[PDB]
């Protein structure tokens, strides 16, 4: 039966660790895919990890030059959550250097973008069958979430971007049914910039927290209903959510220009005027990670907060992060549970290796007792392939 | 329920990438079978990759001398599409140095030919159980499609060849039910030559596009109904489909003798007088690949064409190619969707290695937007086993 | 349907070997997790091996320093009984450096403790979904069974410990339903010490045999009904069950202070006044293993016994051991069958390696003929990674 | 539903190759168990390969000394037919240095013998649960078929041997239901010798062809009904079936003393007075293999034969062989199909290696066309571990 998506987010006081795959550590010997931009999504029966391979294994020569973002060798694959991404335990989804996926309760929808930078095509699959395609409309690296799409009442929603990553671009919202695009709309967002949206369902509507790679060290957001009637803005909190960023101070309801160039995929959960902010501990690089509750951070520019939970140490590598949800249909609860994953990036450019890859950790929001700590990657680089 | 096979091919304007396994790249470290002549076929529930192993893994000593076509060690195995062919994820089908397979909607039929060059026997299995055999009738390398057989209304059809590969030979059409041969007929084709047929269902009849290894740089074809009442001919288009071949010029409805010796397994899709032609970019070797639409190419000798889509670069290795279909029972469409796979051959004879193997890519025909590009093998030879 | 748990233990005259995975031997080449504290538990359909990984594979550099008990890299995983614990065949359960698991007949309950030594949190999962958490209440290494929890009539029971491991600590009994804690009680046990309880169901009540790490070379026990109304004591037999211990002599119904410091996880089965005692053959180190029937050993201090069966040779490595049961729902018997597993520890601290790991053997209680022998680990250390 | 076992063997004119796993070749790099005495057995849904591991992988140090027959490390495992026996694809059955297995249509029965030479115990499992045990009654290497047991009308039958392997011993027939021994009888066979019986069902009765290791270069046989009312004898044919043996001449209905010491596990199929004989091509060592039809060979001493089919070349390694059947319930036929497997032994004692292991091939009896050939192991010894 199709996910209803009409309940609100569950109240959350803390985050319980959900999984950790130790990919890099194990790939030191085992047969583990070189990967990046992993993410988690759940069917009514299980939770899977999606990832973009580089068509190579760790500690092999073909892992060389994997700093590179796009190529014909990259593919979208998935394995069970907490398991290592291996050729022996991973299912093939699509050929892609950018992707999204989500389960509407009936079947898996996957979105895989491949092809040249000036004419990339997104292939939509429903239950493993090609159901639709969309070609670049600006001919400049058509790209998408790199996390799960959001499903409500039999429809799945995603956001896509085409154009410059350092200037005004084009952003479109899609409504998809049975892997078929049934409605789309371009966002009227002059001076905004959207990348790698983390979108989730909440009371029959979708909320996306994204990445301003242009000129915003705070995060941009889009919320829309099933008819794609949307609203835009930036998270107001003085607790800046992007990386790099400036030290915490007074925030803005518009793009915070200071340290606003570049960025990293992230997320956040809106509760009334309050916000759950996941972010790196460092303001300059992709190190550490922490969850921060600002009861007034969604609409207020104050730099205060009530709660702060450690996820990854300040001196440890982190990277991308994104949201995923567990619907009532899966949990048996009467509300949509917020979860999140973190990508722990190892290798280039920060380390002396020929390769770049990441492992993952994940947490779920609970109202019972929790605790901070540091669950880092834990691999020792360089590897033998790098010597 | 059994596939009806009575709808016509879906109209197709372009080809969307469906899968890529990156076998050679991964086999550089992982435990991946040395293989060749792979192909794809679909049950009403999934799509699998079939392949002939050499009973050896890449980057191992036993991969040595794998240039050789036939031997007792070769076996027919299958794994899920897009996955690497590994001993840890592959299912054993049959002992074979030549094979075909297809699902009639109820169960898998596999055809595996093994034994000596002068008395090979084809073993038919239905749902993994031996249901029939056929021995060589000309005692000269009994061989078959190396791609999926075609199923219609509970019957599966294949084509087999016995005799010289550089002169007139013998070609038979078979009708098979529950893995049991219920009717066969010899093709009356003096001056024709058939090898490695790519056959597909279309409106209750079967169409096969094959390989004239004798004296034809254009492709031969056979079409028959369920009672094995057939027609033969050659694709007329001046867009020659085999390799090697001459530069494009005026074609023929008979075998184009020029550069007609040798060849490579290929395919094509007939739409009225028009044809979808898949072929290498090079006219001399197995490099590149492209899809070309000639609205008059099936029955006309003109060397014109409306559409051309790049699949593999001119300077990249290709190889065999073949068709497969997804029936309405699988897709939910009201027509039979045309798909195709390409074998990317690496190693001998063109490269300095002790071994020969291939990886695969696949596409499906869509009417939505698509794009050309190059999705090559991407491995760096020689391997460590070759040093 | 939920396990009834109301039948009594089956009479048992001997122990039949049930499984052996040969993990270390195979991990010498294969991709096998470095593990410790493994244990077995059964659903109404199968029996699985649970284990705590160190996030590393044998014969790899990351296996280094695995003597260490707790860290963020450790995870709870499971595979089918008798199979090697591998990334390619193991299912991920939870992030944990201490754990318990058990099936109530409907779904799997897993308990994974992670976090810092001064604030560890136990995460309860039911069917893979987080259902509850418990934080350390003494802020000193919250820890649990390291073996299966006990289920009766739809409720699962475990025992947890927080505080010193060399002095008085705090011990709590939990009642859990659908992975949700519905009742708990602190044990009033001054001068007792409980660690790593081996608990089993018997006639609608739970019996736990544990490890006094403080001052008892005989084993402590807890028995309670569904309402958590409990009794405590120590096994009286002069056949001391812990390691290290003194030579057999007159026992005590209280902690035997002599050689009472430290210990090792163990178990025992109560039959009236009699006891089935599993223990190391050595009184000083973790070598050998034997099953001993003392018809008066539960309540009597005599050092006599009727039956003695060899499991592991005196000069062979052993380690932890624990009980598991097979309910009538699984076996078809009208009684709860007692089984047990043994952890064969290799590496540090007793051997010259950088790593520490264990393999496992298991037996089931039968009333038919059996025999003693020695089923040791059988690996040759050091490994190549240690050179 | 339970196998009826009441139809007769299907008429067979030849043997079609069914599978080949290429284990040794692949284990040169892959993670493949060192094994010996493999065998095949079928459930109503699939056919599996059973084998005794040595608790080690090929090309690893622990494979050393695997010439040895019995040890605590050996285990009974199974994987799908034609697949390599790997820790990543094999299911654990039982701890054993001798075994049998068979499916009664409802569940798998496995028999695993382990323990010391002077008190071995056979553990019977039904659907993975221990259901019974039998201890050595002569205290001299209790051993069994090393091939599938035979099932008829809900009962499974096996033969076991205890005592000298070079003199008179003790042989018992067992009737087993739900893994529980319900009847047994000792064979009154003075001057006979039985080892490693290949037993099959035929018209509600069981026929076993075995190995006289004492003083018979022709094969001994036992046939019994469900009540264990039996008959004994030796295959009369002058086509001697054991190895070693003398050149073919006039046979005997008693043990052929000439070259009668030692032997090798084999099989044969009785059709009236005629016999299908599988045997090595060499009379002195375990090389080659061939199927021979002697229409009068069961009861006649003539050294004539009608049909001879090559399976393995004279100069290629062979080894054990055994029968297995596919019941009507599996095939849909109205008769029990005879199949057979061959073990291709590599390594010690005949080759310069530290290890010993085997791969397998299998065939099924058909009435359609077949052909002889040689499907050998195909590995190049020694391996790197042997250097
Ligand atoms: C093309 C712009 C885009 C967003 C800024 O770049 C991303 C940033 C990179 C990064 O900041 O880590 C990694 C992503 N793989 C890349 N996405 C693609 C499709 O290349
Ligand atoms: C026997 C003739 C046949 C068709 C020309 O050869 C094929 C060509 C070879 C090729 O051109 O690549 C490879 C095929 N493996 C081979 N088929 C067999 C059965 O050996
Ligand atoms: C923290 C005390 C506890 C019980 C004595 O230590 C155990 C003993 C160790 C041992 O004696 O082998 C190994 C266990 N992994 C360890 N448990 C934890 C959680 O660290
Ligand atoms: C114990 C006698 C027995 C039959 C002759 O030996 C067999 C012969 C050996 C052989 O001839 O190859 C291998 C078998 N693994 C062995 N069986 C056992 C249980 O050790
Ligand atoms: C939070 C919410 O709206 N829950 C609704 C519930 O009220 C309603 O009964 C059901 C449809 O019947 O869908 C769900
Ligand atoms: C590490 C490795 O695989 N080797 C090569 C390296 O020698 C070369 O300089 C580089 C060029 O791109 O690519 C890589
Ligand atoms: C909460 C909600 O949107 N309910 C919808 C209903 O409005 C819609 O008409 C129907 C179409 O299938 O699906 C359901
Ligand atoms: C293209 C085509 O012939 N489609 C047919 C449909 O008309 C028919 O109803 C059905 C059998 O009832 O089989 C299918
Ligand atoms: C690369 C390898 O495996 N080694 C051998 C090579 O030395 C030998 O000359 C050849 C002969 O066929 O076969 C191979
Ligand atoms: C479209 C078509 O061929 N329909 C066939 C029918 O003609 C045939 O008699 C029957 C036999 O099973 O199967 C169906
Ligand atoms: C040992 C025992 O108490 N067995 C009981 C049985 O008597 C009872 O009939 C059943 C519930 O009806 O539960 C079980
Ligand atoms: C065996 C190995 O992996 N190497 C290192 C070793 O050189 C180092 O001294 C030690 C320090 O903790 O950790 C490990
Ligand atoms: C033997 C036993 O405890 N039976 C219980 C019953 O007492 C209890 O009221 C019920 C609640 O679900 O479950 C069952
Ligand atoms: C060969 C043989 O005996 N076949 C029998 C068949 O005659 C009988 O009808 C059935 C039981 O009804 O069992 C089977
Ligand atoms: C090949 C190998 O693993 N090494 C040893 C070898 O050095 C030793 O002499 C032998 C003794 O049994 O066992 C093995
Ligand atoms: C052919 C045959 O033996 N049929 C048997 C029948 O004789 C027996 O009484 C029954 C017991 O379950 O099972 C069936
Ligand atoms: Ca930014
Ligand atoms: Ca040609
Ligand atoms: Ca103690
Ligand atoms: Ca003999």
Author numbering:
A (entry chain A), B (entry chain A), C (entry chain A), D (entry chain A): 83 to 469
Paste lines from the article.
Stimulated by the first neuraminidase (NA) crystal structures, the NAIs were designed to interact with the active site of all NA types. We identified a novel isoleucine to arginine change at position 223 (I223R) in the NA of a virus isolated from an immune suppressed child on prolonged oseltamivir and zanamivir therapy. In contrast to the frequently observed H275Y change, which causes selective resistance to oseltamivir, the I223R mutation conferred a resistance phenotype against both oseltamivir and zanamivir. Our results support this suggestion by indicating that a ligand-free form of the pandemic neuraminidase adopts an open conformation. Together with this structure we present the structures of the I223R mutant neuraminidase in complex with oseltamivir and zanamivir to investigate the resistance mechanism of the I223R mutant neuraminidase.
By comparison to the oseltamivir inhibitor constant (KI) of wild type NA, the KI of the I223R mutant increased 48 times and the I223R/H275Y double mutant KI more than 7500 times. The change in the KI for I223R (48-fold) was largely accounted for by an increased dissociation rate constant for the enzyme-inhibitor complex (15-fold) rather than by a reduced association rate constant (kon) (3-fold). In the I223R neuraminidase, this pocket is occupied by the side chain of R223. In displacing the two water molecules seen in the wild-type structure, the arginine makes a hydrogen bond with the side chain of serine 247 (S247). As a result, the side chain of S247 adopts a different rotamer and is oriented towards the active site which enables it to make a second hydrogen bond with glutamic acid 277 (E277). These changes in the structure of the I223R neuraminidase result in shrinkage at the edge of the active site pocket that accommodates the hydrophobic pentoxyl group of oseltamivir. Thus, oseltamivir binding to the active site of I223R neuraminidase requires the reorientation of the S247 and R223 side chains. Moreover, the reorientation of the side-chain of E277, which is required for oseltamivir binding to wild-type neuraminidase, is presumably made even less energetically favorable in the I223R mutant by the need to disrupt the hydrogen bond between S247 and E277. Thus the binding of oseltamivir to the active site of the I223R mutant results not only in changes in the conformation of the side chain of S247 but also in the side-chain of R223 being translated about 1.1 Å out of the active site compared to the mutant ligand-free structure. S247 therefore plays an important role in the decreased sensitivity of the I223R neuraminidase to inhibitors.
